[PDB]
CSV table of C-alpha atoms and ligand atoms in Angstrom, one decimal:
chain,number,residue,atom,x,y,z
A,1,UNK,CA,30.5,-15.8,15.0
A,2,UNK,CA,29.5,-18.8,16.7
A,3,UNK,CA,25.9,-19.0,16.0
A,4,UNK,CA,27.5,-19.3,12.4
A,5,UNK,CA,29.2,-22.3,13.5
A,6,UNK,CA,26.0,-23.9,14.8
A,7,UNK,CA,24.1,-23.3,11.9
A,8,UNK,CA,26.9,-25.4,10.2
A,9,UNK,CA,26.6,-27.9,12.3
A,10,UNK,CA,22.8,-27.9,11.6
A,11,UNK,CA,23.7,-28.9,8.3
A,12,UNK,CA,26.0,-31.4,8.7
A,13,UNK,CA,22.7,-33.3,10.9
A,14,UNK,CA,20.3,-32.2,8.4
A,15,UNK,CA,22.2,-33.0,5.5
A,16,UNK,CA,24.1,-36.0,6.8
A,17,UNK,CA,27.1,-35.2,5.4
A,18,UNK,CA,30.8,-33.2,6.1
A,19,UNK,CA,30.6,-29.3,5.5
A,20,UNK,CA,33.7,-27.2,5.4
A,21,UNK,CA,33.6,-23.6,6.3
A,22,UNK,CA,35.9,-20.5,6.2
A,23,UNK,CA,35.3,-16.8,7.1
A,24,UNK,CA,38.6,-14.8,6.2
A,25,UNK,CA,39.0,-11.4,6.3
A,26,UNK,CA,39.9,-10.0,3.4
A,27,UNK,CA,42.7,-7.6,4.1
A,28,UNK,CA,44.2,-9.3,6.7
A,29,UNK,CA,43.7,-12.9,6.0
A,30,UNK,CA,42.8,-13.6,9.8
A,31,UNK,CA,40.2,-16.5,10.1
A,32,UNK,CA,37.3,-15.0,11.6
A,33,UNK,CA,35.6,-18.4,11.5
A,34,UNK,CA,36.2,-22.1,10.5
A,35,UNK,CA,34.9,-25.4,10.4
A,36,UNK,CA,36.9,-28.4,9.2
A,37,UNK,CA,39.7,-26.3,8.0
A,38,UNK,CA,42.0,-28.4,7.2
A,39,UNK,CA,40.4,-31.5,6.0
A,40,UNK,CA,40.0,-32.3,1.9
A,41,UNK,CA,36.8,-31.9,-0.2
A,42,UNK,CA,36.6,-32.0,-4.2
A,43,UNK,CA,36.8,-28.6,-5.6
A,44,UNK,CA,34.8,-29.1,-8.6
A,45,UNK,CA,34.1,-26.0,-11.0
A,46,UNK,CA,35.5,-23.7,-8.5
A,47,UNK,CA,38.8,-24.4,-9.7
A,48,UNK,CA,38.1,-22.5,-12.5
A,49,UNK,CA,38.9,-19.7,-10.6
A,50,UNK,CA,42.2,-20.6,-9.5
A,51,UNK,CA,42.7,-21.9,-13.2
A,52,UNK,CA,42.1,-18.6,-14.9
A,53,UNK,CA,44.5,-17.0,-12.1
A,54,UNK,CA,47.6,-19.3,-13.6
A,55,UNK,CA,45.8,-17.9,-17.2
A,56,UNK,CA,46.6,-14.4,-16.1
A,57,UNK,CA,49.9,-14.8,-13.9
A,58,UNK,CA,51.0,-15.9,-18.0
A,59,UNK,CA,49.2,-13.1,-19.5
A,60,UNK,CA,51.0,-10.7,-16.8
A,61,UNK,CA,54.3,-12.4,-18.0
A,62,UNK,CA,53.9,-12.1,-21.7
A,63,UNK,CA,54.0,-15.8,-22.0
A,64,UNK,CA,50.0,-15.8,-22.9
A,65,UNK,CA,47.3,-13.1,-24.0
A,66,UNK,CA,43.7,-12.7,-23.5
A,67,UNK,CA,42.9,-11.8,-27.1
A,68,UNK,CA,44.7,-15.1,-28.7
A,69,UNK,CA,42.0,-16.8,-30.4
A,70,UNK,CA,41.7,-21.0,-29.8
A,71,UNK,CA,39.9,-23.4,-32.0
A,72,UNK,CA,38.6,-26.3,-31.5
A,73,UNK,CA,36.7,-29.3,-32.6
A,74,UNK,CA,33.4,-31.1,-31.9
A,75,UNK,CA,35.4,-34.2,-30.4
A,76,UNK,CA,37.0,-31.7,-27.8
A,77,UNK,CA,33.4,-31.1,-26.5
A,78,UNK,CA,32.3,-32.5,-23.2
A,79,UNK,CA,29.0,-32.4,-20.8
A,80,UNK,CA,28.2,-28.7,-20.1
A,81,UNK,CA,29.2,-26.6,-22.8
A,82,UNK,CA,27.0,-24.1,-22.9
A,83,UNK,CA,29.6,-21.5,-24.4
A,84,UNK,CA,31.9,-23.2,-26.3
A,85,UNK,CA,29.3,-25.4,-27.6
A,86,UNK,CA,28.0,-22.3,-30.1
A,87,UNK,CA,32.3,-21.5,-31.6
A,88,UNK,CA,33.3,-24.6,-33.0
A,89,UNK,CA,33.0,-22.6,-36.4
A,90,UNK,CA,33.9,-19.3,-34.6
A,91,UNK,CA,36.9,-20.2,-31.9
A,92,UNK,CA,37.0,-18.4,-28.6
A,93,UNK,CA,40.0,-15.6,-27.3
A,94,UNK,CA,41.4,-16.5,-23.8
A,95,UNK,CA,39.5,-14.0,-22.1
A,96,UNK,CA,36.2,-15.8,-23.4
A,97,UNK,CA,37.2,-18.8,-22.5
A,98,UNK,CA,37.7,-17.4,-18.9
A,99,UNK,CA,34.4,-15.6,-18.8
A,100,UNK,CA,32.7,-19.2,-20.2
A,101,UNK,CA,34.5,-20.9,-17.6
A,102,UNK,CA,33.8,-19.0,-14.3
A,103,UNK,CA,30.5,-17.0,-15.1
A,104,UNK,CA,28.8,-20.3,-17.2
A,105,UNK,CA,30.9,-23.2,-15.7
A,106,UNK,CA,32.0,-24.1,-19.1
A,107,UNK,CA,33.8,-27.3,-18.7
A,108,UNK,CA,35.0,-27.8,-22.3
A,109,UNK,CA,36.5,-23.6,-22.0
A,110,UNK,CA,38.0,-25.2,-18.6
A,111,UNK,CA,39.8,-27.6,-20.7
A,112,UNK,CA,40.7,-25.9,-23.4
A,113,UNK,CA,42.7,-23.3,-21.0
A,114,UNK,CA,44.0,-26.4,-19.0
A,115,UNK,CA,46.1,-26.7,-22.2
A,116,UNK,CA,47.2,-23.5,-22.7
A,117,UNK,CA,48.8,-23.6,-19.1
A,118,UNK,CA,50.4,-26.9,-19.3
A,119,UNK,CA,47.6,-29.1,-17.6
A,120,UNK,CA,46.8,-30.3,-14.0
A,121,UNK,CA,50.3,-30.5,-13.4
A,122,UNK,CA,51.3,-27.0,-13.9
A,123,UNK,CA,47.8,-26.0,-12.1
A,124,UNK,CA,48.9,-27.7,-9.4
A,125,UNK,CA,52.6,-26.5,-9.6
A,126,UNK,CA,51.2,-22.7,-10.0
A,127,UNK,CA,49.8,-23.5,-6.6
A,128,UNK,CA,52.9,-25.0,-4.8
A,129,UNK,CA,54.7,-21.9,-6.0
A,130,UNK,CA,52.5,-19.4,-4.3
A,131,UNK,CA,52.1,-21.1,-0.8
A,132,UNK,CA,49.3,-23.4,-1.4
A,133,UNK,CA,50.6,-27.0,-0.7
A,134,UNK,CA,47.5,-28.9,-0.4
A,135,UNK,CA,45.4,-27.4,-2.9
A,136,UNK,CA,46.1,-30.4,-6.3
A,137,UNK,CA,43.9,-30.6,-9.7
A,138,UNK,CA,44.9,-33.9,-11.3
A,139,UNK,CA,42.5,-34.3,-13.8
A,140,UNK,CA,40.3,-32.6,-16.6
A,141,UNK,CA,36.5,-32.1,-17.1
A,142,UNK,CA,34.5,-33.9,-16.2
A,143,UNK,CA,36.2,-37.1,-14.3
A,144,UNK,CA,37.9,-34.3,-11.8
A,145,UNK,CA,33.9,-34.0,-10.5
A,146,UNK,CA,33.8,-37.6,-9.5
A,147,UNK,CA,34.0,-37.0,-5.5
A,148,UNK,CA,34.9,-40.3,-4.9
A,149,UNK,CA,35.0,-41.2,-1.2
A,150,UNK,CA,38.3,-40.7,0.4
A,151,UNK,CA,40.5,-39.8,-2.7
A,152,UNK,CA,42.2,-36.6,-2.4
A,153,UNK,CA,42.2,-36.1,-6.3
A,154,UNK,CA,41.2,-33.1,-7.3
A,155,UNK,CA,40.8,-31.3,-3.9
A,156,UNK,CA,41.6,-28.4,-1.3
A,157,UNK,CA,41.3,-27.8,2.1
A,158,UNK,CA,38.5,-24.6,3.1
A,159,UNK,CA,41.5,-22.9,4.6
A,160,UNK,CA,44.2,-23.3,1.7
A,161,UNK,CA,41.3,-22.4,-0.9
A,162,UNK,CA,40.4,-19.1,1.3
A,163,UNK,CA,44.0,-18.0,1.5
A,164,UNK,CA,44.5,-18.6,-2.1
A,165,UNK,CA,41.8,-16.9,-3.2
A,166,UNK,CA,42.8,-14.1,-1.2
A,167,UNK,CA,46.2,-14.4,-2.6
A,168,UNK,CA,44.6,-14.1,-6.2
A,169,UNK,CA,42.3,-11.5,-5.9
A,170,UNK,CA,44.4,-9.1,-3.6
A,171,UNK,CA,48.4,-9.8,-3.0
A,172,UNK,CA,50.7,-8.8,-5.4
A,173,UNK,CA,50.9,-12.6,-7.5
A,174,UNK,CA,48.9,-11.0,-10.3
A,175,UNK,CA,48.8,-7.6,-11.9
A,176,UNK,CA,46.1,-5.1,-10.6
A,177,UNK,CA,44.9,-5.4,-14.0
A,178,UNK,CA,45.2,-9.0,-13.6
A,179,UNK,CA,43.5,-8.9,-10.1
A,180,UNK,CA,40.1,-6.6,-11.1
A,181,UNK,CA,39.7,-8.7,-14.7
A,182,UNK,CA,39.5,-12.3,-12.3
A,183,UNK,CA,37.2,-10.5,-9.4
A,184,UNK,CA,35.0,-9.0,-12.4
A,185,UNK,CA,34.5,-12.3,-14.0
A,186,UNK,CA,33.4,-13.3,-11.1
A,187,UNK,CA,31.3,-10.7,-10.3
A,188,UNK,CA,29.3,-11.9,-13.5
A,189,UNK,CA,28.8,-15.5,-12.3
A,190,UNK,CA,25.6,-16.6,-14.1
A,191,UNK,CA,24.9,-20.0,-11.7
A,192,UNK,CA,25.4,-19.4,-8.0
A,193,UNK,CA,25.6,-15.1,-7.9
A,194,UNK,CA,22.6,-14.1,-9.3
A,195,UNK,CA,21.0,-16.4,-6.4
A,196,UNK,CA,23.5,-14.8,-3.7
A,197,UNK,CA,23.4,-11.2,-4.5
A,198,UNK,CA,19.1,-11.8,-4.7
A,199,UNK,CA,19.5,-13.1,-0.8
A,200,UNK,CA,22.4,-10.3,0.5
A,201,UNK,CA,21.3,-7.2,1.6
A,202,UNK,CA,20.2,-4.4,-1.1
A,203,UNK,CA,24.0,-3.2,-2.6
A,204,UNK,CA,26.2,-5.6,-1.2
A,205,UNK,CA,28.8,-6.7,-3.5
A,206,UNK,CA,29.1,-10.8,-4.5
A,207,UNK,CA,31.9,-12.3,-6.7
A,208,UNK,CA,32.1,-16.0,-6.4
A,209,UNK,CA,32.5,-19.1,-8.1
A,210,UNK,CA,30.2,-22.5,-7.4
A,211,UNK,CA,30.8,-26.1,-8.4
A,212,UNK,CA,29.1,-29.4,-8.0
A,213,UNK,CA,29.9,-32.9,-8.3
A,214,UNK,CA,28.9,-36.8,-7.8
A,215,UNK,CA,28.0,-37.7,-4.5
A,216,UNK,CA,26.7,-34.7,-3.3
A,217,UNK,CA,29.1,-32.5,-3.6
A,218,UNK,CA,28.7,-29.0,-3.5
A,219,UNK,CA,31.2,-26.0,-3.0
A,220,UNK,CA,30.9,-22.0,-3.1
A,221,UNK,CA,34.1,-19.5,-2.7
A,222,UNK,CA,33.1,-15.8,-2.4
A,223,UNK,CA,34.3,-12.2,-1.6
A,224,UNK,CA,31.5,-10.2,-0.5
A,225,UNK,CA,31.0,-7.1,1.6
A,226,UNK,CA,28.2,-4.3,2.0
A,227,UNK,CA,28.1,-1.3,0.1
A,228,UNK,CA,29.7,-2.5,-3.5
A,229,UNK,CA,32.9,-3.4,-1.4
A,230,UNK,CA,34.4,-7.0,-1.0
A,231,UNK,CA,35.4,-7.0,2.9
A,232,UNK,CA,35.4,-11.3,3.4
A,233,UNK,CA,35.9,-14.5,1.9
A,234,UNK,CA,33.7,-17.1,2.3
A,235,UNK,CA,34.6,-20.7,1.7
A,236,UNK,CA,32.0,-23.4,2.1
A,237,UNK,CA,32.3,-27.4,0.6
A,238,UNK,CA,30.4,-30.2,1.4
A,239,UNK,CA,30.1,-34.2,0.1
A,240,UNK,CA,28.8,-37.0,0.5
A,241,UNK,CA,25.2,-35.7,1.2
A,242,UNK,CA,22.1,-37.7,-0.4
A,243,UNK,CA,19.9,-34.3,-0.1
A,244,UNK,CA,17.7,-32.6,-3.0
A,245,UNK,CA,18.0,-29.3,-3.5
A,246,UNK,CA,15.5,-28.1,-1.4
A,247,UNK,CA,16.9,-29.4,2.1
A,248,UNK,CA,20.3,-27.8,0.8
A,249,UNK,CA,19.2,-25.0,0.3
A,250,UNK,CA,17.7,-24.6,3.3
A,251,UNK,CA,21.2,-24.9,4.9
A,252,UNK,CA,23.1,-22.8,2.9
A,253,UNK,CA,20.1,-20.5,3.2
A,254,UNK,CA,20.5,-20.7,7.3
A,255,UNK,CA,24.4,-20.2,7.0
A,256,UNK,CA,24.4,-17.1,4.7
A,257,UNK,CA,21.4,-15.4,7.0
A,258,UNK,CA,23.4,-15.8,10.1
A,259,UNK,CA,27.2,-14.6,8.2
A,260,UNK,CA,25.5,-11.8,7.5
A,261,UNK,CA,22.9,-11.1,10.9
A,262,UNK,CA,26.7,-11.3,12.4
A,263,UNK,CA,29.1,-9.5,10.6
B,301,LIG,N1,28.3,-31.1,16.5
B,301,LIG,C1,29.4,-30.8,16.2
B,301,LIG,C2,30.7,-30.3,15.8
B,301,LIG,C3,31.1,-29.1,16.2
B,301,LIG,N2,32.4,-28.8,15.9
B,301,LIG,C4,32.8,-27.4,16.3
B,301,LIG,C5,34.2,-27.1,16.0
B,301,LIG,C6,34.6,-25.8,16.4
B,301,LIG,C7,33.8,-25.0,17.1
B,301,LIG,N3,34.4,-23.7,17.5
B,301,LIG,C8,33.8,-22.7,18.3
B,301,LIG,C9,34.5,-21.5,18.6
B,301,LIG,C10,34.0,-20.5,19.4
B,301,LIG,C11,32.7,-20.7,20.0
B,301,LIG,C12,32.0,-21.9,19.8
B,301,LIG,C13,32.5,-22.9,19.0
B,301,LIG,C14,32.5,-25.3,17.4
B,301,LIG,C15,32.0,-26.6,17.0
B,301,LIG,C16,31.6,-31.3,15.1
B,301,LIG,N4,31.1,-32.5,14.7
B,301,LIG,N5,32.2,-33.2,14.2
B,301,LIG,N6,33.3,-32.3,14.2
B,301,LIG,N7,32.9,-31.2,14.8
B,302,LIG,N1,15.6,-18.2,2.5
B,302,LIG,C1,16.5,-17.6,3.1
B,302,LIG,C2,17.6,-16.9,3.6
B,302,LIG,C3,18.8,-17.0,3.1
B,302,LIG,N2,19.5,-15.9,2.8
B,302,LIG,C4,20.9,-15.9,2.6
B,302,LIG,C5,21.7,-14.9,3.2
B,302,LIG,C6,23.0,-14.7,2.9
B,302,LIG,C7,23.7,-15.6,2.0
B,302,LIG,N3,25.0,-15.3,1.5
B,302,LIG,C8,25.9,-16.3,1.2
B,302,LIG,C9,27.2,-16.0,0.8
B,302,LIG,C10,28.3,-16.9,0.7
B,302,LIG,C11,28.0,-18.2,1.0
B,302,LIG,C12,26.8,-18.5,1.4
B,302,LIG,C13,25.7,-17.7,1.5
B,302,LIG,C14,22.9,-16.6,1.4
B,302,LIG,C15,21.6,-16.7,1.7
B,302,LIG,C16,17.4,-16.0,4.8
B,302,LIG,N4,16.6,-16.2,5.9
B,302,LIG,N5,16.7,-15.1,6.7
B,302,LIG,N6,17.6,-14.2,6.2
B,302,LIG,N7,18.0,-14.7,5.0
């Protein structure tokens, strides 16, 4: 709805910095509602989503499963590792390195299953193969966070990232297993969701994944809907803001009330 639109552009003022917005609808893809759609902002940890999709498009195909159990050492550890930090001695299957990833942001899990899918590379060629020919990971936690000004490393356009999403969580790339085991993960986000489902109506339904960066940066993707039911996507990024948290918040807080007094 328009008035969504202005409150977008209220952040952009108040903010001083580029915001990227999608509303999609979930079962028919149509864009109900965009802003910058098709210009490039870092992902950050909400690749981690589309990273654990490739994890189960293998598991679907028998080439991976979530039960195989990976070690690893205290040199594989980097910044924010909440998870993984506490199974150096004990290892972690697949399917808790994706729950560390997308409901804690784990960013050494993130790695770890990086590897088992052949890297960036293959991340990024997953993408290519299912329509998405923007969307690029190029490196590995934490550098692919850096947000530098300009470089298209590591980023996706609102639009490609809603349709892909959408892809993932409800067209026929993954297994239904597949797709209810990646929407349930995020379901269970631990950062962002607990925040989102506090703020949406009493039973509405949140899965989503967050991320932030250097510079600023800040992104949320979401499928939410009223009455336990995911009906939309909603893709917001943003960088090169110098705000706290506070005046952020504020926006995003002025964006979500006005998705939601319009739906
Ligand atoms: N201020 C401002 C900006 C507004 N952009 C924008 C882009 C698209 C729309 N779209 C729109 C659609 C229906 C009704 C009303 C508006 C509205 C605003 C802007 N700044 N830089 N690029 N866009
Ligand atoms: N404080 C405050 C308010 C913010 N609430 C709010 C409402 C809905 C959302 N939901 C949301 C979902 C996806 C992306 C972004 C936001 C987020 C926040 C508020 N004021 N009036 N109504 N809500």
């Amino acid at each position: 709805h328009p008035e969504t639109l202005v409150k977008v552009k209220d952040a952009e003022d108040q903010l001083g910095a580029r915001v990227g917005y999608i509303e999609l609808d979930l079962n028919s893809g149509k864009i109900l509602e965009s802003f910058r759609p098709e210009e490039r902002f870092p992902m950050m940890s909400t690749f981690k989503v589309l990273l654990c999709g490739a994890v189960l498009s293998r598991v679907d195909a028998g080439q991976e499963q979530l039960g195989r159990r990976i070690h690893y050492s205290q040199r594989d550890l980097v910044e924010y590792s909440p998870v993984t930090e506490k199974h150096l001695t004990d290892g972690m299957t697949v399917r808790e390195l994706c729950s560390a990833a997308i409901t804690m942001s784990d960013n050494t899990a993130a790695n770890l299953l990086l590897t088992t899918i052949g890297g960036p590379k293959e991340l990024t060629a997953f993408l290519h193969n299912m329509g998405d020919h923007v969307t690029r990971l190029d490196r590995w936690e934490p550098e692919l966070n850096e947000a530098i000004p300009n470089d298209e490393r590591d980023t996706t356009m609102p639009a490609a990232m809603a349709t892909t999403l959408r892809k993932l969580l409800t067209g026929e790339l993954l297994t239904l297993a597949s797709r209810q085991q990646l929407i349930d993960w995020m379901e269970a986000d631990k950062v962002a969701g607990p925040l989102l489902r506090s703020a949406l109506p009493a039973g509405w339904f949140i899965a989503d994944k967050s991320g932030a960066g250097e510079r600023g940066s800040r992104g949320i993707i979401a499928a939410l809907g009223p009455d336990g039911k995911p009906s939309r996507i909603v893709v917001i990024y943003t960088t090169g803001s110098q705000a706290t948290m506070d005046e952020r918040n504020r926006q995003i807080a002025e964006i979500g009330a006005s998705l939601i007094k319009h739906w």
